[PDB]
Structures are given as C-alpha cells and as structure tokens.
C-alpha cells in the first residue's frame, strides 16, 4: 500500500566513514574500559 517504505529506521550518532554506513550508541567504546575494570576486580579476588 505504501508508496515509500513504511519502515523508517532511526540511528544513534550517524554518518559515513569510508563510504561505510556507521551508526553507534553512546557507550560503544566505553566497553574497552569496562572489560579492564572487570579484569582488575576479578584479579584482586584471588589475592583476597
């Protein structure tokens, strides 16, 4: 029935890089430091 696609996607922070569509949430590369905190937390478990 639609004369245009009825699915209109939203995104977070949007744009193209190399002519590659790149979208992301806020906490995309937060997850580098998240895993480092998890390492230190579990490493000190053995010490205690």
């Amino acid at each position: 029935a639609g004369e245009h696609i009825p699915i209109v996607p939203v995104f977070g922070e949007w744009g193209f890089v190399e002519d590659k569509e790149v979208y992301e949430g806020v906490v995309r590369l937060t997850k580098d430091g998240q895993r480092l905190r998890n390492m230190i937390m579990s490493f000190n478990a053995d010490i205690v």
Binding site: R28, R35, L36, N38, M39
Partner: protein, 73 residues
Amino acid sequence: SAVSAVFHNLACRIAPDYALEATAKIIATAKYGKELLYKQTAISRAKRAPYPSRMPTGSGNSFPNLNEWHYFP
C-alpha cells in the same frame, strides 16, 4: 660449552679415594663449564605463559565473534 666442563668435573669425582679433593682451578673451570652448558637451555625454558581469561583484548580492536581474551579474539 660442555667440552671445558666435563674433564675438570670428572677430575673432582675421581679425586676422593680417602675423601681427597681437587684444587681451586679444577672446581672453577668445571663450575663455569656447567653454567655455560645451561646458558642456552635457561633462556629457552624461560617463557611467560599466555595472558589469562580475565585479561581483555579491548574495543580498540575488531570484534570477531567473542571478546575478552580467552585464547581466541
């Protein structure tokens, strides 16, 4: 390295016959030959074991399927 080790070391071994000893030169050379014998072996056996499961690979690298180092990513 074991050429200059063996015959000085064996000289100290045959020295006991009433619990006699070898002189200071003989024990020195055999000790230093024994030390240089293990010189090549010690470096080879010295290895720091691969990083633990706790250690991550971070989001500074691509995600292949799984993340957080466990002998895969």
